[PDB]
């Protein structure tokens, strides 16, 4: 579960752990993973022009800071069968920092 962290640290975590597959900007393209602009408050599997797995659409999670933290702890345990091949951020502070950044950077 989420507590406010450091967006500055979260930016560095994004650059090293997520940027490979994702962009955050309004104008950012889908890559291996979908662009994440507007992710919070949208249901999973809803970015236009991206081909999601059945598993991601089926989860139908309304993304918020708390379920994002559970997801990022271990994506495959939260959405078994997702094609996001990322083992997770096991340190709670890392998830808090990353999500603090993501809440701002995807607006
Ligand atoms: O809201 S934010 O959480 O993002 C946030 C923004 C700013 C800010 O001061 C703070 C928190 S408070 C703060 C938090 C943390 S910590 O919690 O992350 O440890 C460490 C520090 C720190 O002062 S020290 C520090 C570390 C680094 S770094 O090591 O190179 O990243 C760069 C700068 C810097 O001062 S310079 C620097 C560069 C930029 S930028 O836009 O050019 O990236 C913006 C700012 C800068 O100060 S404003
Ligand atoms: C490539 C090796 C990736 C890494 C590194 C990261 N993500 Fe990812 N992500 C990737 C794919 C292929 C997908 C689609 C999964 C599917 O099953 O269809 C995703 C999906 C997400 C989502 C959900 C998006 C949505 O429902 O619209 C989120 C919120 C997400 N990814 C976040 C995220 C974070 C925060 C990352 C760094 C910790 C990260 N991803 C890395 C591919 C890859
Ligand atoms: Zn400062």
Numbering used by the authors: -4 to -1, 1 to 103
Question: Anything the authors wrote about it?
Answer:
Here, we describe the tsclx4-/Zn-directed assembly of two proteins: cationic α-helical cytochrome c (cyt c) and neutral β-propeller Ralstonia solanacearum lectin (RSL). Sulfonato-thiacalixarene (tsclx4) provides possibilities for protein surface recognition (e.g., lysine encapsulation) while simultaneously supporting a metal site that can bind to other features on the protein. Whereas sulfonato-calixarene (sclx4) consists of phenol monomers linked by methylene bridges, tsclx4 is bridged by sulfur atoms that enable metal coordination. The metal-binding capacity of t-butyl-thiacalixarene has been explored extensively. In each of the model systems, incorporation of the macrocycle–metal complexes contributed to protein assembly and crystal packing.
Co-crystal Form II was obtained at 10 mM zinc acetate and diffracted to 1.3 Å resolution. The structure was solved in space group P212121 with an asymmetric unit comprising one protein chain and one tsclx4. Similar to Form I, tsclx4 was bound to Lys4 and supported a tetranuclear zinc cluster. The fifth zinc ion was also present, but in this case, three phosphate ions were bound. A sixth zinc ion formed coordinate bonds with two of the phosphates and two water molecules. At 1.3 Å resolution, the tsclx4/Zn/phosphate clusters were clear in the electron density map, corroborating the Form I model built at 2.4 Å. Water molecules coordinate each metal ion in the tetranuclear zinc cluster, fulfilling an octahedral coordination sphere. Similar to Form I, a second cyt c was bound to the zinc cluster via His33 and the C-terminal Glu103. In this case, only the side chain of Glu103 coordinated the tetranuclear cluster. In Form 2, with one tsclx4/Zn complex per molecule of cyt c, the packing is denser (solvent content circa 40%) and the largest protein–protein interface is 350 Å2.
